[PDB]
Paper text:
Anchoring of these surface proteins to the cell wall peptidoglycan requires transpeptidase enzymes called sortases, a product of an srt (surface protein sorting) gene. The membrane-associated sortase recognizes the LPXTG motif of the substrate protein, cleaves between the Thr and Gly, and forms an acyl-enzyme intermediate. According to the current model of sortase-mediated pilus assembly, the pilus polymerization catalyzed by a pilus-specific sortase is followed by cell wall anchoring of pilus polymers by the housekeeping sortase. To understand the molecular basis of pilin sorting and pilus anchoring within a bacterial strain, we investigated the housekeeping sortase, GBSSrtA, and a pilus-specific sortase, GBSSrtC1, from the PI-1 pathogenicity island of [name] SAG 2603 V/R. Either GBSSrtC1 or GBSSrtC2 of this GBS strain is capable of polymerizing GBS80, the pilus shaft of the GBS PI-1 pili.
The two molecules of the dimer, related by a non-crystallographic 2-fold axis, in the asymmetric unit of both the type II and III crystals of the GBSSrtC1 display the typical sortase fold made of an eight-stranded beta-barrel. The barrel core is flanked by two long N-terminal helices (H1 and H2), positioned approximately at 75° to each other and away from the dimer interface, which is formed by β6 strands and β4/β5 loops. Subtle differences, such as one single-turn α-helix in the β1/β2 loop present only in chain B of both dimers, and a four-turn and two-turn H1 helix in the type III and II structures, respectively, may explain the plasticity in the sortase structural features, the presence of multimers in the asymmetric unit and the observed multiple crystal-packing arrangements. Residues 44–55 and 44–54 in type II (A and B chains, respectively) and 44–51 and 46–53 in type III (chain A and B, respectively), which cover the putative active site from one-end to the other, form the lid region in GBSSrtC1. Despite the high flexibility and temperature factors (80–100 Å2), residues 46–51 were consistently positioned in all four of the active sites. Analogous to the Asp58, Pro59 and Trp60 residues of the conserved DP(W/F/Y) motif in SPNSrtC1, Asp49, Pro50 and Tyr51 of GBSSrtC1 anchored the lid in its active site. In addition, the preceding leucine residue (Leu47) was observed inserted into a highly hydrophobic pocket in the active site present below the lid. The residues in the hydrophobic pocket included Val118 (on the β4 strand), Ile162 (at the edge of the β6 strand) and Tyr171 (on the β6/β7 loop). The three catalytic residues Cys184, His122 and Arg193 of GBSSrtC1 and the corresponding residues of SPNSrtC1 (chain A) displayed similar spatial arrangements; Cys184 and Arg193 were present on the β7 and β8 strands, respectively, whereas His122 was on a loop extending from the β4 strand.
Numbering used by the authors: 2 to 39, 44 to 51, 60 to 206
The structure:
C-alpha cells in the first residue's frame, strides 16, 4: 500500500551499481527512440513488459507530491487493477527517468475512498514541486503549466524537444469527468536532502 513503496526503496539498494546502470541505459535508449519518432498515437488511458528494465518488485518508481501529501508507487501501463494500487504510466510517452527531450505521462483515479490518490490534484499549483524516485535515484520537477483538455486532444502529451517534462494527468471536473486535467512539471536540479 504505502507498504509496497518500502519494498521498493530497500530492494533497490540490494541491486548493485553495475546492474542498475545497465537497466538505466535501456531506459535512456527507449526514450531516445521516442524523442526521434514521427507519432505513436496515445490511447487515452480511459502483461505489459515495455518497461521491465525499470521494474523492481513490480513497480517502476514512486511519485511524491508534497502539496497533497502523497507518495504513490508508479506501475507500467494504464491497466485496470493497477490504477487501484497507484499511478499508471501512459505507454507511448517517455519513461520517467528524465533527460533532454523527455515527457513522461503519469495518471491516477480520484475519489476512491480507500486510496485517495489524485483526487486532490486540483490543489496543486504552478510553482509546486514533485519528485520521482526510480531505480537510479530521485529527480525533481516544478509545475510550470496547468491545462484542461477535451479527451479527444493529445498534442500536449507529446515530447517537446530539448525540454524535460512530466505530466500528472487526471479527470476533471471532479465527479463529472468530461475533460482531463494536466499538471505539468519541468525538471529542476534536485536539492532536498
Amino acid at each position: 500500500s504505502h507498504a509496497n513503496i518500502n519494498a521498493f526503496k530497500e530492494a533497490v539498494t540490494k541491486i548493485d551499481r553495475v546492474e542498475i546502470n545497465r537497466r538505466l541505459e535501456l531506459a535512456y535508449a527507449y526514450n531516445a527512440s521516442i524523442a526521434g519518432a514521427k507519432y505513436p498515437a496515445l490511447k487515452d488511458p480511459y502483461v505489459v513488459e515495455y518497461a521491465r528494465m525499470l521494474e523492481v518488485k513490480e513497480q517502476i518508481g514512486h511519485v511524491i507530491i508534497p502539496r497533497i501529501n502523497q507518495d504513490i508507487p508508479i506501475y507500467a501501463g494504464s491497466a485496470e487493477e493497477n490504477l487501484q494500487r497507484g499511478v499508471g504510466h501512459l505507454e507511448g510517452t517517455s519513461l520517467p527517468v528524465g533527460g533532454e527531450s523527455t515527457h513522461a505521462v503519469l495518471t491516477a483515479h480520484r475519489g476512491l475512498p480507500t486510496a485517495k490518490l489524485f483526487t486532490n490534484l486540483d490543489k496543486v499549483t504552478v510553482g509546486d514541486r514533485f519528485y520521482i524516485e526510480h531505480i537510479g535515484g530521485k529527480i525533481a520537477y516544478q509545475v510550470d503549466q496547468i491545462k484542461v483538455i477535451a479527451p479527444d486532444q493529445l498534442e500536449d502529451l507529446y515530447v517537446i524537444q530539448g525540454e524535460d517534462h512530466v505530466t500528472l494527468l487526471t479527470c476533471t471536473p471532479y465527479m463529472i469527468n468530461s475533460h482531463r486535467l494536466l499538471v505539468r512539471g519541468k525538471r529542476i536540479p534536485y536539492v532536498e536532502k
